[PDB]
Design a protein around this ligand. Structure first.
Ligand SMILES: Nc1ncnc2c1ncn2[C@@H]1O[C@H](COP(=O)(O)OP(=O)(O)O)[C@@H](O)[C@H]1O
Ligand code: ALF
Ligand SMILES: [K+]
Ligand SMILES: [K+]
Ligand SMILES: [K+]
Ligand SMILES: [Mg+2]
Length: 501
DNA sequence: TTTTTTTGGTGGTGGTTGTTGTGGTGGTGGTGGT
């Protein structure tokens, strides 16, 4: 049901142009990108379109992965020549760069000039091809009135992308969307945001946002919550978890790394994104933070169903997807776990095991011949035999393709490197974090019809604008600590947008 | 104040980094593995 404007951008891409297209929050940029990818893939081949964004959550929104994950450059910090050498070792990433025909990059506002220039070097060098990006077709999408790249604060609204040599030679074409969809119900709200987008906040606009400080309805819809800093986010996530009914399950990380200063180690540990102490409950909302396979990536959203050991989960999964599931099969595995292990492997202590929440057996429930749910009492027995085995969270993850894949999530390992690649710090922990609340950075690209926003710690230009334009309706938005002095837009972006009509 | 991540050969400034190689479609490495 794409608009006249959206379809012409898709059709322009068919003609082979290297395009950047843009528009205010909620103009339908990502919804259009999703559809565009199908036709680029039909032109180039299923495996030959790189779909990428600046953050994990924004990449998942269009079925892709982070530009960093795609390129194979790690953090991509060093000289272009060093990154290229890292890339050319890894067979997956070198072949990817040689074979792809198109590179899709969403939320481009968060990509700094150095990365584009280095990426240009990499594509030119790998493909033996002096075209702007080795000839890869470029589709760039985002809004530079939103967040700039993440940096600290020497003198760094880091030169944005439009200042990169790679950009000026590569980007052939720009397209601007104008119609705001996200907030379409509320024209006064849309006008307030777009002027807020440009850093032009008047008194009357300020009055209306300060009016939205009233609390949200206590209704069963759990709100999204947005904060500037990870510390704010963790407090909001842990609060919501404590309101959930249920026994807490504690997962303490295993940390290491061959550095003598314990404090220095902890500084490096903070940026691993998986918590030291992961607390989960049945019903907890979680986010995947590691790239495990093709459709389970950083940004995948899920809900904890229960906690089971691998033997129990094999039975749970098979009971799911059952032709009719004669309860005899479950019984064989119950009294003879040696047969469960073989069955499981054919396809490949002092703490009481709490029984499974009855909600996890609801899928079979939606005539006493078939209402004999002995399997529920059979599944509970098999689970009880897991006393003294590790019980992992079963999470229903939802991918960008609308699939609802159930995964019993095992611990993974993280490591960082040096100027070269010696590991400084390493951790083993589940690749999960609570995700009712989101940082404003990772929220960028999301649509949040019920959201609380606390602007108390906003610092970068455009951050306040990003947070409020996630909302759909004013009735579903609360804003705390709005301050107009913290919303001024970057003049370089105002100027750049002047060559656009 | 915030984001970004890692198998194999089209490296060798390292095995303390290989259950990540119980490898070999690599050689400007050798405290690793056969
Ligand atoms: N043509 C359209 N018709 C109806 N709704 C749309 C259309 N385009 C976008 N939307 C809605 O607008 C919201 C934001 O769109 P999105 O593609 O995320 O914009 P952006 O990526 O620019 O923020 C989505 O929830 C989507 O449902
Ligand atoms: F610019 Al957006 F969601 F991608 F507001
Ligand atoms: K090696
Ligand atoms: K060797
Ligand atoms: K080797
Ligand atoms: Mg988008």
């Amino acid at each position: 049901c794409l608009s006249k404007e959206q379809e012409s951008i898709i059709k322009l891409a068919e003609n082979g142009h290297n395009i950047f297209y843009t528009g205010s929050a909620g103009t339908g940029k990502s919804i259009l990108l999703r559809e565009m990818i199908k036709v680029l893939k039909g032109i180039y081949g299923r495996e030959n379109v790189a779909v990428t964004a600046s953050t994990g959550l924004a990449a998942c929104n269009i079925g892709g992965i982070t530009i960093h994950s795609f390129a194979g450059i790690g953090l991509g910090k060093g000289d272009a020549d060093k990154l290229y050498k890292k890339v050319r070792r890894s067979r997956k990433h070198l072949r990817r760069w040689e074979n792809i025909g198109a590179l899709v990059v969403d939320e481009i506002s968060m990509l700094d000039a150095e990365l584009l220039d280095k990426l240009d070097f990499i594509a030119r060098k790998i493909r033996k091809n002096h075209q702007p990006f080795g000839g890869i077709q470029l589709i760039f999408c985002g809004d530079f009135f939103q967040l700039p790249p993440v940096s600290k604060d020497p003198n760094r609204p880091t030169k944005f992308a439009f200042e990169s040599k790679a950009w000026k030679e590569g980007v052939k074409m720009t397209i601007m969307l104008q119609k705001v969809f996200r907030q379409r119900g509320d024209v006064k709200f849309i006008d307030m945001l777009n002027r807020m987008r440009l850093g032009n906040i008047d008194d009357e606009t300020e009055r209306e946002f300060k009016k939205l400080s009233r609390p949200l309805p206590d209704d069963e819809i759990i709100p999204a919550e947005l904060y500037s800093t990870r510390m704010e986010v963790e407090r909001a996530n842990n609060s919501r978890l404590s309101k959930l009914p249920g026994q807490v399950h504690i997962f303490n990380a295993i940390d290491g790394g061959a550095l003598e200063d314990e404090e220095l180690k902890e500084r490096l540990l903070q940026n691993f994104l998986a918590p030291k102490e992961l607390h989960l409950k049945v019903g907890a909302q979680v986010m995947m933070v590691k790239n495990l396979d093709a459709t389970l990536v950083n940004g995948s959203l899920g809900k904890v169903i229960e906690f089971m050991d691998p033997e129990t989960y094999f039975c749970y999964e098979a009971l799911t997807n059952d032709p009719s599931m004669p309860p005899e099969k479950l019984e064989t595995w119950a009294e003879n776990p040696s047969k469960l292990k073989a069955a499981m492997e054919r396809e490949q202590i002092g703490e009481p095991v709490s029984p499974l929440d009855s909600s996890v057996f609801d899928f079979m429930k939606r005539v006493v011949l078939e209402n004999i749910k002995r399997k529920e009492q059979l599944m509970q027995t098999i689970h009880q035999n897991s006393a003294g085995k590790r019980r992992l969270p079963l999470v229903r993850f939802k991918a960008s393709d609308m699939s609802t894949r159930m995964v019993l999530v095992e611990p993974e390992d993280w490591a960082i490197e040096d100027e070269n690649e010696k590991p400084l710090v390493s951790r083993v922990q589940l690749p999960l974090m609570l995700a009712w609340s989101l940082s404003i950075h990772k929220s960028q690209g999301q649509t949040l019809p019920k959201v609380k926003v606390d602007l108390r710690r906003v610092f970068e230009k455009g951050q306040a604008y990003v947070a409020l334009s996630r909302a759909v309706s004013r009735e579903g938005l609360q804003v705390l600590n709005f301050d107009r002095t913290r919303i001024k837009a970057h003049q370089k972006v105002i100027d750049f947008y002047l060559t656009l009509s």
